[PDB]
Amino acid sequence: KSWIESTLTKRECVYIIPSSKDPHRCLPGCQICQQLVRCFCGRLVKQHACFTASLAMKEHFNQAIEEWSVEKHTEQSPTDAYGVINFQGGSHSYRAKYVRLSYDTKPEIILQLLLKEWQMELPKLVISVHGGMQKFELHPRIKQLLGKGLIKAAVTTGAWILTGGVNTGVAKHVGDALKEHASRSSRKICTIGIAPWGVIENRNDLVGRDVVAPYQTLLNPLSKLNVLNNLHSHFILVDDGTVGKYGAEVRLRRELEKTINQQRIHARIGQGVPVVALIFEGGPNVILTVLEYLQESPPVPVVVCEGTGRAADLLAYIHKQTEEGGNLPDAAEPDIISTIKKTFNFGQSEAVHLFQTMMECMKKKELITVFHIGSEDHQDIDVAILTALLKGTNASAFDQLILTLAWDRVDIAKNHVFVYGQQWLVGSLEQAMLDALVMDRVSFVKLLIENGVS
Incomplete structure (x- = not known):
């Protein structure tokens, strides 16, 4: 009778073709x-x-009727796998x-899964970490x-x-970041892991309505499949019926980012x-993912971390030369x-x-931001992630202050928005303080008084 039991569906094979x-x-x-088909x-x-x-x-040798589809050979039925993944290990x-x-879930139902059911607050930033999917390593200076x-x-x-x-990609290095660093305000960080329901080791231990x-x-049973990470707060396990395949997560993750x-x-x-x-690392499929981000509808700026491995060093090596x-x-x-x-x-x-794919990425070089790890003076990735949203998108100078005004972060606004050359028009700075007073952004009221507002 609950919301999840009445809306979301699972999928299973019904039409065996070997x-x-x-x-x-x-x-x-x-x-x-x-057994062995x-x-x-x-x-x-x-x-x-x-x-x-x-x-x-279903001579013949199971041919000409193959035509396999998760649309035409799979049955929808309500979800039996929601609840809580209390992790046994890592004393906290x-x-x-x-x-x-x-996989066919409507993109607005996924939004009222997050903002209504799970009672998450609407984010002020979405960071989509891509890269390797093969358990790579990192230099500890970089990490x-x-x-x-x-x-x-x-x-x-x-x-x-x-x-x-899943714990066999860049989600581990995001998970290691959440471990080695601040766990005081990490209760406020929402880290969503959108994985398939065909890759997870102990799926059958996750079956059941609302439960811990x-x-x-x-314990690594030969690592033939992969396991969830400890330090993700929310998981969206995407089912398309099949078992042991990748690919159902891709459209549901991107259409979440659109909405x-x-x-x-x-x-x-x-x-x-x-x-x-x-x-972070890459692969040959991540270069297509970068090119996809740059060309849809007003684009997603990418942040490439060089030194971190395989294909991110390539996008930095092109961006340099x-x-x-x-x-x-x-x-x-x-x-x-x-x-x-x-x-x-x-x-x-x-x-x-x-x-030829990388050359199509370099037509939009104002959207790609490389981060040179420690050999730089423009360091602190924190700045480089946030400043990538200001440049390249060709927004107004008013629109860059207002985006930093919501973030309550003045170091981005004082050093990058208020730079020499910025032509402020009449009512932009005056309307910005009206927002800065109401939203109780005290350090922006101090910044705009020092810039010409009475």
Whole structure:
């Protein structure tokens, strides 16, 4: 009778079409074995709950009727997996909420899952951390900088950190940041992990309506699948019926970022909630993700952290050696590709196609912000995340002060908005103090009095 029980759905295979070889027909092929078939469902037979598991399961060799779809061969039914993921380990008991969500869930129902059911406050910033998905490592000089810098931007602003949530990617290094640093105001940080329901180790230990589910974080059963992270506060487990596959999380994460960007950041303030991307290691698929962010509808600025590994060093290596309009000086094109040959070993064709993807990223160089870790003076990633939202978007100078006014952060406004050259018009500074008085932003009233407001 609750809201989650009446609205959200789970998905399961009902129409077994195997991916295997028959001894003669329609059925086994290791031995008889009575188990070892492999549906496009992804599970096997005897896993399809009690019914839809029988003989005459779909020369022929399971072809021409294959046509597998999670749209045309899957059954919707209400969710049986919401509650609490009290983690057994790491003496501070970390409570975390979760739900099993369908991939076809409407993007506004997901928003009233977060803002109404889970009673989360509307964020003032959304940080989407992308990068590696293969348990990479970090230089400890880099890790103590990115840890201190990411968590500062989520406390000073009221921010949501969207990770993959699973402990075999960049969600671990966000989780290590939440451990090694401030746990006093970390109750105010919402770190949402949007993962598939086919990757998680102990899914069957998360089954049940509202409950405190005991859940491991260790003991590593050959690491064939992956496990949830301890230091995420909320999990959105995306189900598309299948088991052991990746991909259902991708559209539901991005359409969440669109609808939060559509929401209004404050009652007085008339702007959308800003969304920023963060790129730790990479992979060949992250270069497509960066290019996707730059070209949709007014774009998501990306923040690339060099030194952190594989593809983020490539986007920094291009950003260094190009023209402001994104033009290599016609003599470095083999010099670029041979670096891609070493990092991403595909060879001579797909590295060329990956170079054409990076050249499309360099047309919009005003939206990409590289962070040079410790060899810099423009340090403190906290600044570099927030200043990426001001430059590149081509907003008004009034609109940059007002965005920093909501964040209650004056160091961004005093050093970057109030710079020489900014042409303030008549009623912009006067209306900004009217917002600064009502919102009880005392340090902005001090800043605008020192800039010409009576």
